[PDB]
Ligand binder design. Structure first.
Ligand SMILES: Cc1cc2nc3c(=O)[nH]c(=O)nc-3n(C[C@H](O)[C@H](O)[C@H](O)COP(=O)(O)OP(=O)(O)OC[C@H]3O[C@@H](n4cnc5c(N)ncnc54)[C@H](O)[C@@H]3O)c2cc1C
Ligand code: NFU
Ligand code: NFU
Ligand code: SF4
Ligand code: SF4
Ligand code: SF4
Ligand code: SF4
Ligand code: FES
Ligand SMILES: [Fe+3]
Ligand SMILES: [Fe+3]
Ligand SMILES: [Xe]
Ligand SMILES: [Xe]
Ligand SMILES: [Xe]
Ligand SMILES: [Xe]
Ligand SMILES: [Xe]
Ligand SMILES: [Xe]
Ligand SMILES: [Xe]
Lengths: 437, 253, 291, 437
C-alpha cells in the first residue's frame, strides 16, 4: 500500500481532489474522491429570507445547471405552502428543463473526449485544434449548446440563472412568434443530437474494445469492470421530477439520512508516492498529509443507509431496467438521453397555450409545514426540502446529485489504475460547486 | 504577432461565468484560433498549476478561511499582467455577501470577499450572469492593447477605461447604487434600463423612477453598470457603428 | 488595584463557591454566575438579568430576560455555542420596564455592554440602566453545527443523552445522564471554532464588574475576579450575608499561575492573527477593529 | 450422472439435506435442497384459537427471528379486523424490527466465516480459537449481538419471543430513561457495525479473487458464476414491510400460488456416490434411497408461477437496482444492510414520544374478511394472511422467507462442485424451522 494524490482534478466543474491508496501494481485499493470547494452555505443563509429570494440565490450554486436549482427550490416552496401552479407554467418549466439537459450533456462531451480515441486509431481527440474531424465535431456541439441556451432564454427568461420562474408559476408566457421559434430550433436540434448521439456511442464502443490507454507517455491497462460498484441507483423520473404535492411521490424522504464524511471517508494519511510527469504538473509532493474525513467539504446523503449513484444511468436503470454498470455504461446512458429532450420540447410546445395563465390566482404564505421537490437535473436527483411560514424560509435543505455521487464514485475507484482514476470520475459528470452549495 | 496568453482562474464561483464565455460559440473558437492561448482552466484543460498569464479571467470570490484559496488569488496577481474580475461574484461579492457559515462539512467557512479586497484588479466585467458579448469585447480589446498598432491600443485603452474605473470605484454592488450615485445625485432620467438588466426582476419604475425590492436583489452591481448615467464615455459610445464594425471584423472568417 | 496585562484590572481574586446547595446541584462549576444574579435580584441591585436559557434544540442556548429566582436557575451549565446575549439589552428597558438590568455572558459580550454604555448608537436609556455585569472566562466558542459534529461524530454521543460538557486538560468532555464519559482531543476540534474568536484578546472577561471561570480552581469551585466598585459592593455584601465559601487564590492549586499562562497563550496567538490581517493580501489587508 | 447426498447440513438453522445429481467431474447437474424438519403445523393449529394467542405461538416458529413472526402475525390480525395502531406503537415496532435485523446478520457472520479465508492467506477463519484476529472479531460480533438483543428487549419486552406486541399496538411504552439508553446503545452499535461491515466486505472481496477453496483436504475449484439462477427476486420494503391496510400495498396476493414440492422437486433416486472424508462424518451411504418430492417438508410458494429469491439481495435489487447475483452477491448485499438498521433506530427514537399512546382505543372483533401483512424479516419477505371473525382465527397462512428460497437455491446449485454446494446454501442464511413452521 502506497498513497498517491491528484489535486486538483480537471475536466469537471469545480475543485476536488483524489486521495488514493494503491497496491504494489499501482491499482486502487481504496480511493477517496472528495470536494475541497469552500462551503458557501446556501442552506444556512436561506433561513429568514423570503421564499421569493431563496430560489434566485440557490440558482447561483451552479451556472451549468441553474435550471435545476431554480425549479427544485421554487417547487419546494410551492409544496411547503400548498400552491398549485397553472398548466401553462408547468409546460414552460418542462421546456426550460429539457433544453438545459441538452446543453449540459453537450458541454460534458467537450470535457470527456480528450480521454477518448478517434475510433480505430491511437490518436486522442483534440478539439481545440483546427484539424478534422475534431473541428466539425466541435461545430455540431457548439450549435447544439446554442440552440439549447436560446430555448432556455425564451421559455426561462435567461439561459444562466433563469428569471422567469417565480412562486406560483412564471413571470411571462411567450408570444406566438416565440413558440414558433422554439419549435423551429428544436427541429434543427433533434437532427443534430441524433448525429452527436451516434458519434459519441461509436467512440465509447471503440473504448470498450481497447486494452490500454496512454496517460502522460505510458500505457495504462483498461480494466474490464472499470468503475464498478455495488451501491445501486436512485432516480425520481426519466425526465422532470416529482414533489410532495403529488398524489404518489416517487421519492421517499423516510429512506434518506445525511451523515458526515466521517462515516464513509478515510482518516489521516501521508502521501508516499508521487509522479511529476502526470499531465500536466504531477501529483502531490511526498510527505504531504491528507485527511479526507476532515478535508471533504460535503455531507454524505444516503438511501437505506448507503450511498447511491444518481444521474442518467440511475434513470435508465430505474425506469427501463438498463442493465450495464460502470464507467462506459454511465457514458452510454447519458448519450441515450439526447433525443427525449427534443421530443419533450416539441410535445410541450404543441400543448402550450400562449394566451394561457402562468400565475396561480392565490399564493398562500405558508404555516411552517414541510414540503419537498425533486428535479432530475442533468447529473441526477436534486431534492430541495423546505418549511415556509409567513412567506419566510424557516428551514431549508439541499440534496444535490454530485453530493450523492461523491461517496459512490469513491467506492467505484477500486480496481482502477490510479492514472485513470480521473476517467472513472468523469463518467459521473461531476459538479463540485453543486455538491457543496 | 503572438497570441496573448489567457487563463481562467476559478475561486468561489458557479462556473456560469465560464459558461457565458463559451456561449460566444464560434467567436470563442475564432479567438482561441487567432488571438489567444488558454494556458490555464481547470474545467477544460489539465494544467494543474497557475502558469504566467497576460490576462487572467478570475471568477468567484475568496473564502478567507480556506488557505489554498487565499494563496491562489495572491499567486494570480503575481503571475498575471492584467487581472480581470469576471462576473459579479469576483467584482462585488454577489450571492457570497450572504454567506455566514454553519453548514457541513466546514462550518467555519464563513467569510467571502470580492477579489479586489485582497489583490489589485485592473478590469471589471460585471454581471450575473455576465453577457458573453462583453467578455468577448473585453478579450479582443485586450489583444489590441498588447499586439496592435498605436491607433488600436489607443482605441482599446479608451474602451476599457470605464471598466477600469469601476474596478477603482469599489467592491460593492447593490440596487442602492442607483439611489446613492444616480437618483440622489440628480442624474436619473427614467429610461428604465436598470429594470431590463436586473436578473431577478427586483426593479420596477413607479412614475418614471426606480423602485427596488431589496430583499429580492442578490447584490450583483448590474444595474449601476448598465445605467447610462453611471459612466457614459461619449468618445467611445458615439462611435458605436465604427467600433461595432471593428469588432465584427476581428471575428470574421 | 492590580493591573495584570493578561488578567485585566481588578481589586482581588479568590477561589469561591456558593453556599446555596440547590444551586450547586447543576451549576457548571462553583455556581458563581447563578448565585450572584439570584442574590442581586433578592437584594434589589437588579430587577432583571439576561441569561442563557434553554432553547428549542438540545444544548442550544436561548437568551432571555429572567426576573425570578426560578428563571435564573434555568440557565445553569455551560453551552458551547453562541448565545446572542445582547439582542435583548435594549428590550429589557422597554417592554420589560426594568430600571436595573443585569447581563451575563462571555468576554466579547461584556465589551458590547461597555461600548453601549459609552457610545450608545440607537441604544437610548441603556447606558444608565446597566446595573451589574457578570462575565465568564472564555477561550473560544463554536456554532451549533460544530457542537453537533463534535458531540455526535467525535465523541459519538447522542445530544439527547448529554448531562454536561467540559473543555479542560486538553480534551472536550461529554457526560451522559446514564453515567458514561467520552472525550475528544482538542487538536481535532480546531477546524470547528468560530472564526471571529481568533481576534479576541480577552480571556477572563476584563470589562465585567465581576468575572468568573473554571481554570485555577478545583472541580466544583470557581476562580473569581472582583473588578469594579459595583462588583465590590455586591461581592462584599454577599460574603457578609453568607452566600459564599472563599479561599485566597494563592493557597489553591493550580491557582493564578496556570490561569495567567493560558490567558497569555490566547492573547499572543490571537494578537498574531490580528497582526497578519494587516498584510493578508498583496498591497491590501483586512480591517482591524482595534486600529 | 451419479447421486451424492449430504445429510444433515450444518452452519444454518434447522434440519435440511442436499440430494445432488453430479456429472463425471463432480459438478452439480440438478440438486435438490429440501427441509426434513418435522412439520409442527402452526397454520392448522391456529384455527379456532384467539387472535391474541396465535401471534405468540407463531413466534415460537423460530428463535432467531421471533420479531418477524410476532409482527407479521399481529399485523395480519390487525389487517383482517381493520385496526389502525397508534403512531408510537409503530415506532417501537420498527425499533424492535431493526434491532433484530442487526443481531440476525451478526449471528450469520459467525456461521459463514469458517468457509472464508483470512485475506491473502490460505488459513481459514477459526473463531472458537483463542488466536488473532479471529478473537477480536468474535468480540466485536458478541457486542453487536448484545446491543441488538438489549434494544430488542427494551422496545419489545423480550429479545426472543417479544412480549410487548399485542393486537392494537404494544403493552408498554418506554420511560425517558429507556429511550436515552436505546439511543446510547445504537450510537455504540453504529460504529461497530460499520467496522464489521467493512471487515466482512473485504473478506468476501478476497473470496471473489480466489480460484479454489480447500474442503476436507482437497482443492475445490471456485466457479465464477457460483450460485447463479434465473428466478429473479421479490421484496416488499427495504426495511419494515407492508400490509393490506396500506393505501398502496407493495405485495400482490393475486400473483402468489403455493404448490407442493411435487411440481419442482426430483422424484425417487438412489445414492451411488459417497465420500466418508467430507468434514466431519461423510455423506449418505451408497444404496440409500431418496425422494425429494416426498421427503421435502415444505410447500413451494411461487410468484407469477415461478419460485423466487427473497432476502437482503432481493431488497437491494428491488429498491436500488443492485445488479450483482449469486453467492457472493448475496453475502455483499446482506452486509450492506448493517448501517440502515442503526440509522433507523436513532431516527425512530428521535420521533418517539414516551408519553404517547400505544394501544388503539377500539379493537374490532372481525367479520371474516381476509387481511395480510408482510414483514421484511432478516432473510426475506414474511407474509401472514388471516381471516378473523369474533376474535377467533378462522383461516391462517404463512409464506416464510426460507420457504421461498428453498426451490430457488436448489436451482442455484447447478454448476457448483458438490463439495461447495453448502456454500451456495449458506448465502441464503437459511432458517429451516421458519420454512417449515
Ligand atoms: C464558549 C464558553 C467558553 C468558555 N471557556 C472557558 C475557559 O476556557 N476557561 C474557564 O475557566 N471557563 C470557561 N467558561 C466558563 C465556565 O465554563 C463556566 O461556565 C463559568 O465558570 C460559569 O460557571 P458557574 O458555575 O458560575 O455558572 P452557572 O451557575 O452554572 O451559570 C451559567 C452561566 O453561564 C451563562 N452561559 C452559559 N452558556 C453560555 C453561552 N453560550 N453564551 C453566553 N453565556 C452562557 C449563563 O447565562 C449563566 O449565567 C466558558 C463558558 C462558555 C459559554
Ligand atoms: N446536474 C447538476 Fe448540478 Ni451543476 C449537480 N450536481 C444540480 O442540481
Ligand atoms: N428471517 C427469518 Fe425466519 Ni428464522 C425465515 N425464513 C422468518 O420469517
Ligand atoms: S457572477 Fe453569477 S454566473 Fe459568475 S460565478 Fe458568480 S453566481 Fe456564477
Ligand atoms: S437606468 Fe439609470 S437613468 Fe435610467 S431609470 Fe434606471 S437609475 Fe434612472
Ligand atoms: S437590483 Fe437586480 S441588477 Fe441591481 S444589484 Fe440587485 S440583483 Fe443586481
Ligand atoms: S473567544 Fe472571545 S469573541 Fe469568541 S466567544 Fe469567547 S469572549 Fe466571544
Ligand atoms: S446597500 Fe442595498 S440593501
Ligand atoms: Fe446539502
Ligand atoms: Fe406456510
Ligand atoms: Xe465551459
Ligand atoms: Xe467550451
Ligand atoms: Xe479566451
Ligand atoms: Xe477559455
Ligand atoms: Xe488594462
Ligand atoms: Xe473569449
Ligand atoms: Xe483586458
Amino acid at each position: 500500500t502506497k498513497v498517491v494524490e491528484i489535486s486538483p482534478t480537471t475536466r469537471l466543474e469545480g475543485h476536488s481532489k483524489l486521495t488514493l491508496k494503491v497496491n504494489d501494481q499501482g491499482i486502487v485499493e481504496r480511493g477517496d474522491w472528495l470536494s475541497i470547494t469552500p462551503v458557501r452555505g446556501i442552506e444556512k443563509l436561506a433561513i429568514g429570507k423570503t421564499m421569493e429570494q431563496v430560489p434566485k440565490i440557490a440558482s447561483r450554486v451552479c451556472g451549468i445547471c441553474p435550471i435545476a436549482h431554480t425549479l427544485a427550490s421554487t417547487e419546494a416552496m410551492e409544496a411547503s405552502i400548498g400552491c398549485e401552479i397553472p398548466t401553462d407554467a408547468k409546460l414552460l418549466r418542462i421546456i426550460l428543463h429539457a433544453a438545459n439537459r441538452i446543453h449540459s450533456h453537450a458541454l460534458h462531451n467537450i470535457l470527456i473526449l480528450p480521454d477518448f480515441y478517434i475510433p480505430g486509431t491511437e490518436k486522442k481527440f483534440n478539439l481545440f485544434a483546427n484539424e478534422q474531424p475534431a473541428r466539425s465535431v466541435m461545430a455540431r456541439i457548439v450549435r447544439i449548446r446554442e440552440i439549447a441556451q436560446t430555448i432556455a432564454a425564451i421559455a426561462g427568461g435567461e439561459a444562466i440563472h433563469p428569471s422567469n420562474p417565480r412562486i406560483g408559476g412564471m413571470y411571462h408566457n411567450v408570444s406566438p412568434r416565440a413558440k414558433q421559434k422554439m419549435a423551429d430550433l428544436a427541429k434543427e436540434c433533434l437532427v443534430l443530437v441524433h448525429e452527436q448521439m451516434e458519434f459519441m456511442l461509436d467512440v465509447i464502443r471503440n473504448m470498450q474494445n481497447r486494452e490500454f490507454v496512454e496517460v502522460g507517455g505510458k500505457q495504462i491497462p483498461l480494466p474490464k469492470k472499470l468503475g464498478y460498484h455495488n451501491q445501486g441507483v436512485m432516480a425520481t423520473a426519466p425526465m422532470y421530477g416529482s414533489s410532495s404535492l403529488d398524489d404518489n411521490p416517487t421519492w421517499d424522504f423516510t429512506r434518506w439520512k445525511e451523515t458526515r464524511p466521517w462515516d464513509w471517508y478515510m482518516g489521516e494519511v501521508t502521501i508516499d508516492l508521487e509522479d511529476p510527469s502526470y499531465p500536466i504538473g504531477g501529483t502531490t509532493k511526498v510527505g504531504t498529509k491528507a485527511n479526507p474525513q476532515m478535508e471533504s467539504c460535503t455531507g454524505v446523503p444516503t438511501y437505506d443507509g448507503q450511498p447511491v449513484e444518481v444521474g442518467p444511468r440511475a434513470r435508465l436503470a430505474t425506469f427501463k431496467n438498463f442493465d450495464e454498470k460502470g464507467t462506459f455504461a454511465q457514458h452510454i446512458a447519458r448519450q441515450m438521453e439526447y433525443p427525449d429532450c427534443c421530443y419533450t420540447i416539441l410535445n410541450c410546445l404543441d400543448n402550450l397555450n400562449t394566451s394561457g395563465k402562468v400565475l396561480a390566482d392565490h399564493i398562500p404564505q405558508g404555516d411552517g409545514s414541510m414540503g419537498w421537490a425533486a428535479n432530475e437535473a442533468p447529473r441526477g436527483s436534486n431534492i430541495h426540502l423546505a418549511r415556509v411560514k409567513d412567506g419566510k424560509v424557516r428551514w431549508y435543505d439541499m440534496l444535490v446529485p454530485t453530493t450523492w455521487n461523491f461517496p459512490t464514485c469513491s467506492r467505484a475507484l477500486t480496481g482502477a489504475p490510479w492514472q485513470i482514476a480521473e476517467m472513472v470520475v468523469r463518467a459521473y459528470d461531476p459538479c463540485v460547486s453543486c455538491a457543496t452549495h | 504577432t503572438n497570441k496573448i496568453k489567457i487563463g481562467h482562474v476559478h475561486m468561489s464561483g458557479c462556473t456560469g461565468c465560464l459558461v457565458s464565455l463559451a456561449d460566444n460559440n464560434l467567436g470563442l473558437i475564432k479567438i482561441l484560433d487567432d488571438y489567444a492561448d488558454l494556458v490555464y482552466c481547470l474545467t477544460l484543460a489539465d494544467v494543474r498549476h497557475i502558469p504566467e498569464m497576460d490576462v487572467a479571467l478570475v471568477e468567484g470570490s475568496v473564502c478567507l478561511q480556506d488557505h489554498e484559496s487565499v494563496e491562489d488569488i495572491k499567486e494570480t496577481r503575481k503571475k498575471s499582467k492584467i487581472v480581470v474580475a469576471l462576473g459579479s461574484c469576483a467584482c462585488y461579492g454577489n450571492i457570497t455577501r450572504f454567506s455566514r457559515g454553519g453548514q457541513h462539512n466546514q462550518p467555519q467557512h464563513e467569510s467571502y470577499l470580492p477579489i479586489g479586497d485582497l489583490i489589485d484588479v485592473d478590469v471589471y466585467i460585471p454581471g450575473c450572469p455576465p453577457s458573453p458579448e462583453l467578455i468577448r469585447n473585453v478579450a479582443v480589446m485586450a489583444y489590441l492593447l498588447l499586439e496592435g498598432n498605436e491607433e488600436q491600443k489607443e482605441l482599446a485603452g479608451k474602451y476599457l477605461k470605464p471598466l477600469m474605473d469601476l474596478a477603482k470605484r469599489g467592491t460593492s454592488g447593490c440596487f442602492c447604487d442607483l439611489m446613492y450615485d444616480v437618483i440622489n445625485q440628480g442624474l436619473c432620467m427614467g429610461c428604465g434600463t436598470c429594470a431590463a438588466s436586473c436578473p431577478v426582476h427586483a426593479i420596477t419604475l413607479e412614475f418614471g423612477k426606480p423602485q427596488g425590492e431589496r430583499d429580492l436583489c442578490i447584490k450583483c452591481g448590474s444595474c449601476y453598470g448598465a445605467c447610462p448615467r453611471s459612466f457614459f464615455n461619449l468618445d467611445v459610445i458615439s462611435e458605436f457603428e465604427n467600433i461595432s464594425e471593428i469588432i465584427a471584423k476581428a471575428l470574421k472568417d | 488595584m492590580i493591573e495584570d496585562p493578561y488578567l485585566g484590572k481588578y481589586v482581588t481574586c479568590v477561589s469561591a463557591r456558593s453556599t446555596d446547595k440547590e444551586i450547586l446541584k447543576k451549576a457548571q462549576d462553583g455556581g458563581i454566575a447563578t448565585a450572584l444574579m439570584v442574590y442581586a435580584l433578592e437584594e434589589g441591585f437588579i430587577d432583571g438579568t439576561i441569561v442563557a436559557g434553554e432553547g428549542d434544540k438540545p444544548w442550544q442556548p436561548k437568551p432571555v430576560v429572567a426576573m425570578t429566582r426560578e428563571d435564573i436557575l434555568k440557565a445553569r451549565g455551560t453551552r458551547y455555542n453562541i448565545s446572542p446575549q445582547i439582542s435583548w439589552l435594549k428590550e429589557a428597558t422597554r417592554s420589560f420596564g426594568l430600571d436595573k438590568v443585569g447581563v451575563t455572558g462571555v468576554c466579547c459580550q461584556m465589551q458590547a455592554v461597555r461600548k453601549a454604555q459609552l457610545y450608545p448608537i440607537n441604544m437610548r436609556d441603556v447606558p444608565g440602566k446597566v446595573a451589574f455585569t457578570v462575565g465568564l472566562f472564555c477561550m473560544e466558542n463554536f456554532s451549533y453545527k460544530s457542537l453537533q459534529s463534535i458531540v455526535e461524530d467525535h465523541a459519538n454521543q447522542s445530544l439527547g443523552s448529554v448531562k454536561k460538557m467540559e473543555i479542560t486538560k486538553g480534551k472536550f468532555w461529554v457526560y451522559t445522564e446514564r453515567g458514561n464519559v467520552a472525550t475528544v482531543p482538542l487538536k481535532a476540534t480546531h477546524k470547528y471554532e468560530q472564526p471571529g474568536c481568533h481576534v479576541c484578546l480577552d480571556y477572563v472577561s476584563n470589562l465585567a464588574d465581576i468575572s468568573t471561570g473554571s481554570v485555577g480552581s478545583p472541580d466544583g469551585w470557581s476562580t473569581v475576579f472582583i473588578r469594579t466598585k459595583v462588583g465590590n459592593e455586591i461581592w462584599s455584601k454577599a460574603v457578609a450575608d453568607g452566600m459564599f465559601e472563599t479561599k485566597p487564590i494563592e493557597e489553591v492549586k493550580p491557582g493564578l499561575d496556570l490561569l495567567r499562562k493560558l490567558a497569555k497563550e490566547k492573547i499572543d496567538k490571537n494578537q498574531k492573527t490580528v497582526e497578519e490581517r494587516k498584510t493578508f493580501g498583496i498591497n491590501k489587508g483586512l480591517r482591524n477593529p482595534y486600529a
